[PDB]
Amino acid sequence: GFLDKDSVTERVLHVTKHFEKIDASKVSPAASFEKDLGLDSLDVVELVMALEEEFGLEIPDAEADKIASVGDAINYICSNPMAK
Amino acid sequence: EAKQFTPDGKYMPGIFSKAKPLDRSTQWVHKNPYIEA
Amino acid sequence: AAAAAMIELDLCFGLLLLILFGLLSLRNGHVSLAHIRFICQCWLVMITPLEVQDFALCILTVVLLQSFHSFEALLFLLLAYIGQLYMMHSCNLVSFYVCLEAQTLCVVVLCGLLARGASTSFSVEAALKFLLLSAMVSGMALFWFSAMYQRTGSLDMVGQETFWILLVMLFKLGVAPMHMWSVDLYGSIPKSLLLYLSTAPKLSLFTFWASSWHHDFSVGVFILFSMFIGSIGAYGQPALRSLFAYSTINEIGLLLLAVETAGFHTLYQHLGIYIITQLLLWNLTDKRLFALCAVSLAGLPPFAGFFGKAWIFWHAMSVQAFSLLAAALFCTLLSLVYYLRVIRLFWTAPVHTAASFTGAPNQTTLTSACAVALAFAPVMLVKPFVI
Amino acid sequence: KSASCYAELSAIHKFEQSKTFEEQYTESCIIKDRAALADPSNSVHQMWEYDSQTALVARAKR
Amino acid sequence: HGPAQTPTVFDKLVEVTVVDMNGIRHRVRGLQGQSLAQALVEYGFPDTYFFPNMGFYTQHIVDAHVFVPKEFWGKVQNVDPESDDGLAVKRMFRDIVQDYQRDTSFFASYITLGAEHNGMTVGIGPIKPWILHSEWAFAGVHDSRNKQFDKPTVEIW
């Protein structure tokens, strides 16, 4: 709750939009990286690195491995006490 | 129904006793909150 | 003939032998140096003349050396004592400058050397600030001495340039508003150097003032600044080190009131009682005696601090210095509040005093218990004693 | 687990208990020297390096 | 009085997730009525995280800089900014935190753990170098394995 649940959501959508292997209209506020968006592990790592670039954080390997959804990423950024 | 004295005097504190001992605070008033305020 | 100078040759020979003995002892890996400290105390006694003030300084420095443990610290304290002793005999600005600068360099180096733990950088920082602030005051002293030397053609300390030399002396006593170097020093530097800094140089400089100084000016605004700033600052600062720094500024304002109205007997009595209280304050391990320092620094009647304040008040009323006296009485009324805060902190509390584990069991109970008997000195203080 | 824990504890307690008086007094002198060496301004620190467990001079530092 | 439940410690347990300054999440258990700074001390956090409460008559209380989410902003205890306690908090913000301050910045002794804190996530905030006396200071770097809990006394002198 360290930050709001709307601006972080649209920032997540904004950085999800510029991916060449993703669809710019299929992206939903509550989706999945594997079944819905069709991404393997390296694409997930690339998306998490883009989210880290936008919010100015550092997400370790286990925490980024637990993130499997847009809602999971939003909840992890919201729960982080060092967000920007 | 406490027993705070032996038959030959000798006050007993009754620390571990079940019955409530009569003592200095027995007649302390029950505080009304608005009066205290 | 050099036969009148054997004490100077003895000073130099003793330093030459003491350095060589300290070198030989350290080549054996001795981790304690009580033999070096005893030889240092013997050297202190052997170089001091037979005056009251000289022996007061000597006995004070002998007592102070029991809180210092390394060879270099003992050497720096001896070479600071040479400046402190010979400043009392200085009759010019040449020797005055050299003695003051030797003392400043020794204090700076000791502040750098003795810090430990997480407080090392804070002590080094405060030592650097003190050195920079001391350099420009030393420059002011040299500049106005050169002005006086050009005007008079001699080494007499007369004329308008003595006002700036007086300001140099007021800086060395931590007189407000030039007080913040001491406030910076109190917050970081360890307790043994704080004990050294509050006793010996004030005695040395006030004895020089009593012995060889006249000025045609006043110090009243600095009395007002010191008393009001020290009292209000000690009322407002929650850290105990800052409390004692500001209360020291208040006490030096009272000593300046004693200087300003002449009558140096009250000055010497209050300074002696203050020095004994300082010797008790910085060597305390039982915190109940912290309340005795509080009641004897608040001027409360039966203890000796009352007598030290009250002859200053008596002589000020004798020569009718009414406004400065009224300000002193107001600041005395204010000082009681934070000395009561001290009493609340350390007397109305459960007692805990940790035992020693690595030997040296409560090693300065002799001095602290001896200095607590400032409740028995008032019988001698009421008489015409200090004159 | 409780049985193994008390085996490990009885080892340490037997180690402390079965020391002689002379060893205990030597250890108290060593504790005293170590606390004297904990001062970083100690004048021997610039020449000698001391063994941690016995407070003896191990080597010359410089 | 009847067959009602015996009191257990689990009824009074409060769990707080704490993120230290390295980003490592920690599970911190406390009891109801205990302050947050005490639970942080008893968890085993290093002594560089803690500093004196800078009021008069309360420097024996250890305190820490914590970041509190907006949901739990109203469960920090109220301090009058005109009182002496308010000036104590102002001194702590002026001297210890300085430009590490955020809108979520509080102090951990002003948080009394209850059932409303159960599940709250906090983070430890950074602090500037400070000194109280020669035996209690902080040089500025959190490189020490010494716990605050292992100190036998908190010394104001």
Add this chain to the structure above:
Amino acid sequence: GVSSQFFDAPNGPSVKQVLIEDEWYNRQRSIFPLLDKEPYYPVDVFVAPNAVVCGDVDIYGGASVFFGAVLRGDLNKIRLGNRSAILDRAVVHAARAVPTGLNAATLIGEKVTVEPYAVLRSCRVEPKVIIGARSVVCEGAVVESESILAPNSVVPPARRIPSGELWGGSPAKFIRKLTDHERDRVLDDVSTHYHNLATMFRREALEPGTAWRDVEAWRQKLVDQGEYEWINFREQKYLMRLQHEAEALEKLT
């Protein structure tokens, strides 16, 4: 099995280990460290000569350890509050962990009295508490402030006694509420009474006394016969460490 030699002890390995059946007089110390865990105590503490205080133990203020009592801080820390009394042959221990997940150290507040033959292990006792005789307070349990436990009572692990009440039984149940004067004065009275008794014992103690004269007479007789061995303990500790390092190096390669 675990060896009884420690080469990483703070003061080094033990040069000479004495078997207990070869001891001709009792050498039990009352306050002693366990490797790097040293007890902490004040100047006015009373430790009885047959009481044992070992390991990581913190004692504060006017606390007292009476005859035959054990405070063993080897698995965790133990803290004894200001003017808290441990009476005759009571045991205070501590586990490495507790089921509640909290700190497992045994923490005893100020003005707490613990009656004879009671056992405290990894529990929390708040200030002003009377623990009765033959009572056990188990691992992770909490006794709240201004409360009384009746004699011969069991407090099971991770259980709680509420503040301001008297509890007793096996398992402990509610007996009655303490009166306001009992919470105000009586608990402090019991703690102060036992502190006064400890002060009476402390005034009459001649430490170290004169029992060493006989042992010194025996050692003087050994020096007379030429059978007293002078051991350079510092040098033997140094040489044993060097041999241990050489033996460790001569097996990895």
Add this chain to the structure above:
Amino acid sequence: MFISVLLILFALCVTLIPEAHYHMVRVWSFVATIIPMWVVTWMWWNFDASGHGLQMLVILGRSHLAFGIDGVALSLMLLTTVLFPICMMLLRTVAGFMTFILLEVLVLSALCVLDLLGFYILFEASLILLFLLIGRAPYGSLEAAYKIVLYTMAGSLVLLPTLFMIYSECGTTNVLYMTCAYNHQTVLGWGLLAVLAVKIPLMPVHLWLPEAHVAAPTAGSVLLAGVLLKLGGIGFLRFMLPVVPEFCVSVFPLVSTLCLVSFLFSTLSTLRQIDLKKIVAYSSIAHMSMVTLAIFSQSEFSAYSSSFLMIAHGLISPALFLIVGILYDRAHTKFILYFSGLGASMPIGSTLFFLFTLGNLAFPLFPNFIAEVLCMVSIFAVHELLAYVFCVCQVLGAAYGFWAFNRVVHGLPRGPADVTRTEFHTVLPLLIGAVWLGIKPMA
């Protein structure tokens, strides 16, 4: 002097008794205050009433601290030595015993000193003891302790330079030579007025008393009301009137209006009080205002009547504090709304309360009646209207006294049971003294 050293050294031996012997500690501290009562009674036996004004003199060289006995000091010393064992019966710790023992040493030596610097040293050496007594941690009040200590320090700090001014002027602070030398009386008179108008509660420097006399324990309240206020009166009678009499004439309109407004405004404030201890605490200000105006009248036998009023107040108001202390000790409140019908539940305590209520309102067969009559004779002889102001306002004192008594004693019976043997014997010496001094005070 040798006797006084022996009594001090016997009293100070309470600290060396081991605390586990409870009976011995109680008996030793009680006997340590019983003995000075016998010694002061013997001093009254030794006094020659047809002899000199100052008797049993002793002077300790060049240390100030010179001592002597007159009638006012002797009566006040007798009252203090009565009051201190009753205080010993109301304490339970060695810290309390030692604080009251040190207070008794300081009060007894201050009452009979003949040196102004000695009076300054001896009196306000009790300041830190009063601070610790009033601001005790669980049940005191630090605000009250700060107020009483700061007001007393302010007054004493005004006096101290004027003390030293007359000392430099003539060469001594001995009152026998200060009264025979030429001194600047306006400055010293203002310093002495500054101390003694705080010690005696005179408006506007009177606000410390309602806080301190209520926040104190029962023993502290007995001491503060019955003893420590009268040090201002004996300050007036011993030091200020003999040494600065020109000032004492010239300040009479100002002291007169201060006394009149203190009497009227403090009586008006006492009517709106809702705390029993605050009711008892305010009533002392009006009595001390009558004392001060009777001292300053200097008219018929002013020292006699004013000393007799000081003794009558010092007997009657500690007993009212004792009864309020019993109610607070066994009911845990001092609030009027919690008490009703105390006649049915404490008949002996209510009878004692009624008798001391009548005594405090200066009804006959109590020493306050004789005291107020003679004080108004002394006031009347300067002018009739200054007596009329006190005469017509007697309905205002009786209003608060009877209103407090009628509210707490009659009505529905609720409250604690009647007094014990110990409480009755704390009250009893004051009652016997009142009956004697109100029926046959003189022979």
Add this chain to the structure above:
Amino acid sequence: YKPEVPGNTVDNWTELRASWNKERASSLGTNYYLNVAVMGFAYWLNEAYYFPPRTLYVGALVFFALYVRKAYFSTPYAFKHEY
């Protein structure tokens, strides 16, 4: 009975945080400027000791009335990007 703390906890804590989001300066500048002011300009008060006492007392009250307190000092200029 205990009195209620006046206000709101969020608003009070924002008041407590205000004007302290800034790195504190070292004290060397204040100390050096104080020493320069005293060593350069305190000789201007030498003749002031002989002035009439009404002037000196009114001047002391004026200095007290215009004094700004160093502790808890803050300026709006610390957080603006232009004059």
